[PDB]
Ligand binder design. Structure first.
Ligand code: MET
Ligand code: NA
Ligand code: NA
Length: 496
């Protein structure tokens, strides 16, 4: 079985798995929509009670399975719980990263295409002192690239350039993935993560220098770090906080498990997972939180920044921030750096979510690495046409697979590992070979606090939020077919 070549490379590949678009696009939106600093008290709490324990649990399950040649949750759930229903529940660990990949690589292609056009200077030229006169050209720029209808008709018409960039992005993902774990993902992570850090630091420094008559970036930093204890009672704040922790840490996507399956049987996983989780949080709260919101607040004020963030997740990243840059010296090249930062973040994360499907085809169906990568590329590329041309299909996939799915699967893996497989056996497997050992209190957090926390979250989410959500049926129909297809592939694997 393949294994990570170096200790540093494993850490940077796991950091590249965690540090993604969610750090710079989803997190600023989630923070601004939920009270700014009010979002930060539950966030930190969730990171301590859910993020860190589930990270260690997914690392342990990955390495345990990889020691037996299984990097995917169907086989791993069966090894932890010899039952056919465990294999069915494992199918979710292939279904989530596939559906997430279908729209995540497409969003990644957006960043690459915007990076290209901004580098070449093919950007709108707003008239040099109206907020709408500056925002509207970039709103049309994004709407033309993805093909947003001027009305609400549910058909999208992406530009030919966007489609070509999507093919190029799929090609780039394949070129990295086809070279394996050590010579592909690891070697590229060693390059992308320093590039990602440097770009983020330069953007943070440049944003800190922004001052307009409406405020400064310091006001955005204040808003982000001003506590609001009156929101701690709101369940919606905790739902967003835990969902953001799940998303940003790649928990419940099956990616951490698959990556950890290439960690050697005796190599450390406690400090490694802790370092990767800490690197992700530094990138998120320090770097991600200091670019979008501070620049937005500096130009528009705290009032309009929150309103723009409420306009959607893409508005802050693809319309507002490029427009704000368009009013500063050289801001087009600054916008290029922003989208290039986003692209490397998306790329290091997209290779991670597509590795589970690759690992299943390699481990269980005995396909070659080339054919596993190429067939995974085919399934993702083909299925992506649904997201490309059917309006609001991307949102439905992110809800079922990337939002409810990850929390349900996180509770599922925790219960299989710490309740069915054995709390003491799981604790021994987590701490085995660790350069440091997990604090004793976390044993009770993993056994009682985390599953009770996640169970209450899911119950609240089901009773209070999902009935309202219940052409979206086309997307539901298709992703159900994807689950049946993976179920059939699991059936073929066990029959072999
Ligand atoms: C594509 S891996 C899941 C998302 C990733 N953790 C992010 O923060 O963007
Ligand atoms: Na992240
Ligand atoms: Na990434």
């Amino acid at each position: 079985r393949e294994h990570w070549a170096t200790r540093l490379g494993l850490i940077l590949a796991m950091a590249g798995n965690a540090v993604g678009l969610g750090n710079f696009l989803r997190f600023p939106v989630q923070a601004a929509e939920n009270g700014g600093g009010a979002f930060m008290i539950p966030y930190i709490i969730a990171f301590l009670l859910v993020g860190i324990p589930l990270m260690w649990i997914e690392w342990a399950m990955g390495r345990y399975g990889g020691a037996q040649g299984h990097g995917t949750t169907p086989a791993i759930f069966y090894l932890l719980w010899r039952n056919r229903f465990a294999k069915i529940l494992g199918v979710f660990g292939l279904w989530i990263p596939l559906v997430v990949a279908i729209y995540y690589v497409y969003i990644e292609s957006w960043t690459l295409g915007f990076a290209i056009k901004f580098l070449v200077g093919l950007v709108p030229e707003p008239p040099p002192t109206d907020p709408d006169s500056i925002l509207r050209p970039f709103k049309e720029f994004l709407y033309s690239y993805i093909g947003v209808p001027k009305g609400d008709e549910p058909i999208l018409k992406p530009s030919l350039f966007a489609y070509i960039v999507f093919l190029i992005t799929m090609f780039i993902n394949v070129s990295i993935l086809i070279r394996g774990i050590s010579k592909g993902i690891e070697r590229f992570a060693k390059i992308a993560m320093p590039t990602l850090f440097i770009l983020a630091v330069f953007l943070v420094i440049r944003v800190f220098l922004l001052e307009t008559p409406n405020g400064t970036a310091a006001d955005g930093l204040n808003f982000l770090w001003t506590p609001d204890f009156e929101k701690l009672k709101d369940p919606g704040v905790w739902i967003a906080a835990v969902g953001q922790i799940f998303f940003t840490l790649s928990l419940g996507f099956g990616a951490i498990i698959t990556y950890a399956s290439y960690v050697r049987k005796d190599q450390d996983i406690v400090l490694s997972g802790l370092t990767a989780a800490t690197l992700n949080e530094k990138a998120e709260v320090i770097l991600g939180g200091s670019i979008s919101i501070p620049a937005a607040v500096a130009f528009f004020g705290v009032a309009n920044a929150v309103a723009i963030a409420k306009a959607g997740a893409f508005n802050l990243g693809f319309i507002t921030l490029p427009a704000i840059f368009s009013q500063t010296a050289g801001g087009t090249f600054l916008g290029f750096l922003w989208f290039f930062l986003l692209f490397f973040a998306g790329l290091t994360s997209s290779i991670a979510i597509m590795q589970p499907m690759i690992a299943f085809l390699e481990d269980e169906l005995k396909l070659s690495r080339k054919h596993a990568v190429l067939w995974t590329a085919a399934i993702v590329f083909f299925s992506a046409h649904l997201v490309m041309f059917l309006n609001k299909s991307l949102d439905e996939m992110d809800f079922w697979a990337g939002t409810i799915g990850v929390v349900f699967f996180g509770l599922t893996e925790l219960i299989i590992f710490f309740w069915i497989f054995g709390a003491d056996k799981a604790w021994e497997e987590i701490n085995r070979g660790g350069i440091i050992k997990v604090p004793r209190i976390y044993y009770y957090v993993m056994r009682y606090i985390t599953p009770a926390f996640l169970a209450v979250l899911l119950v609240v989410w089901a009773r209070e939020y999902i009935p309202k959500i219940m052409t979206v049926w086309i997307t539901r129909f298709y992703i159900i077919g994807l689950f049946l297809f993976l179920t059939f592939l699991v059936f073929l694997a066990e029959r072999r």
